[PDB]
Design a protein around this nucleic acid. Structure first.
Ligand SMILES: Nc1ncnc2c1ncn2[C@@H]1O[C@H](COP(=O)(O)OP(=O)(O)O)[C@@H](O)[C@H]1O
Ligand SMILES: [Cl-]
Ligand SMILES: [Mn+2]
Length: 451
RNA sequence: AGACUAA
């Protein structure tokens, strides 16, 4: 039994059995991260189990550290700055960090227990990690716990909450506004506003600030300084990207959710390429997670979820299913085995098994292009599998005529590290490296040989 | 677009 939001004294022993994968499918705010997780960790320490804890984002990592403070845990995330003895048997890191470690040099510990929080995260690295984890379990080398309110196949955007939620459909602005949206600033509580991009977030926050609103912006770029401010200071709005979609305890009263964002899609008509499609409706799982930021406090009964449009369950044309396979085909168990995707996530795309496996040197290039090059999984794979070395940038210029990149409707030209002026015309097109002006600037640095 | 930045 438990009280006062404190971890339970009692933990089922069966969750620690090798060959067992436990899905903890409990509604938002039930206590997965800050109550159940510490119980598991405490018991895993008593059992002397080599343990891995996985957060999707630094937001969830920060929530975990609050719940786990004082326990001998080695934090491998910049979100947390803690003293480590180097003798810890519990590691904590983000999903993508684990997959990166799996892909690289560099022996990963043989964990006996793996706890993944937000085990539905559709990031290609997270899907890949779930493949590796479920394979370790199946092989008898690990027990694993997958925690999420929205496990694969979830279709309900309005799940259970600790307190009643008032679900409201209204038009929501995507850009600044003058009139017509008084309900936004008339509201007297705290609002978490999900925006599809940092650029849109800047515009909306700037607009809210001219109404005399205290606004905190949250994203990968601002997390380090801004997240503690959501915890320690008084604010009216949090304008946030998907960084905050999961796990956050904002102690807020309202979520504004336009339920729409851009997604990478692989096109297979004509030469294969990646576009940024949409903005398109989010999945029911994403909508339920965003909504799940409120109705979290039983003593607070008038919380609101303001949304626009229906969700779209079908995400099968999304690049993340293929990119997860590209990653997982290149991960090995120490026994030598090919990891398979987590059951519920198999046959999301009709790609043949092991078809993305790279040979030795090409595998090393593949990792470099992602980590050093800041290139998407798909693009890194295309370049690596063509036998191109990390430093050879000729492919950025030898694409067909139609692959010419434009900026402000002019042909982008590169001045190379050796002095030549060349037109940016890559052999493979991935809109993620040219759509956003900042991304294009970076890809221009890459094409120059300055990355 | 968004997230991740570890041996
Ligand atoms: N800093 C905090 N102060 C007060 N209550 C909190 C705090 N953080 C979390 N809670 C509450 O504890 C409950 C369980 O939280 P959590 O473990 O984050 O839920 P889950 O992981 O299932 O979404 C929620 O009702 C939440 O609002
Ligand atoms: Cl909360
Ligand atoms: Mn949680």
């Amino acid at each position: 039994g438990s009280a006062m939001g404190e971890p339970d004294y009692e933990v089922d022993e069966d969750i620690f059995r090798k060959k067992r994968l436990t899905i903890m499918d409990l509604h938002p705010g039930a206590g997965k991260t800050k109550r159940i997780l510490p119980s598991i960790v405490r018991e895993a320490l008593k059992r002397r189990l080599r343990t891995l804890i996985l957060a999707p984002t630094r937001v969830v990592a920060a929530e975990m550290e609050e719940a786990l403070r004082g326990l001998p845990i080695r934090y491998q995330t910049p979100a947390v700055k803690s003293d480590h003895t180097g003798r810890e048997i519990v590691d904590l890191m983000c999903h993508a960090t684990f997959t990166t470690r799996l892909l690289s040099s560099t022996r990963v510990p043989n964990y006996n227990l793996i706890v993944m929080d937000e085990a539905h995260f559709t990031d290609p690295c997270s899907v890949a990690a779930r493949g590796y984890i479920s394979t370790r379990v199946e092989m008898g080398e690990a027990a694993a716990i997958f925690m999420t309110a929205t496990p694969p196949g979830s279709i309900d955007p309005f799940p259970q909450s600790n307190s009643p939620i008032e679900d409201i459909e209204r038009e929501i602005p995507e850009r600044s506004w003058n009139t017509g949206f008084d309900w936004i600033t008339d509201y007297q509580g705290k609002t978490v506003w999900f925006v599809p991009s940092i650029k849109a977030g800047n515009d909306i926050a700037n607009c809210l600030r001219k109404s005399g609103k205290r606004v905190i912006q949250l994203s990968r770029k601002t997390f380090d300084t801004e997240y503690p401010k959501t915890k320690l200071t008084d604010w009216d709005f949090v304008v946030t990207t998907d960084i905050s979609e999961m796990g956050a305890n904002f102690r807020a009263g309202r979520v504004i959710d336009p339920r729409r964002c851009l997604k990478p899609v692989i096109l297979t008509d004509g030469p294969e390429r990646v576009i940024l499609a949409g903005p398109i409706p989010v999945t029911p799982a994403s909508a339920a997670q965003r909504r799940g930021r409120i109705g979290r406090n039983p003593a607070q009964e008038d919380d609101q979820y303001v949304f626009s449009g229906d969700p779209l369950k079908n995400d099968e044309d999304h690049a993340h299913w293929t990119e997860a396979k590209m990653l997982l085909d290149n991960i090995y168990t120490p026994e030598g085995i090919i990891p398979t995707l987590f059951g519920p996530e198999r046959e999301k795309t009709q790609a043949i098994d092991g078809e993305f496996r790279l040979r030795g040197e090409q595998r090393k290039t593949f990792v470099e292009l992602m980590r050093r090059g800041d290139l998407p999984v798909w693009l890194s794979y295309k370049v690596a599998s063509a036998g191109i070395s990390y430093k050879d940038r000729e492919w950025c210029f030898t694409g067909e005529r139609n692959n010419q990149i434009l900026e402000e409707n002019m042909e982008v030209e590169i001045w190379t590290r050796e002095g030549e002026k060349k037109k940016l015309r890559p052999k493979w097109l991935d809109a993620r490296v040219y759509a956003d002006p900042m991304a294009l600037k970076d890809f221009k640095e890459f094409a120059s040989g300055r990355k």
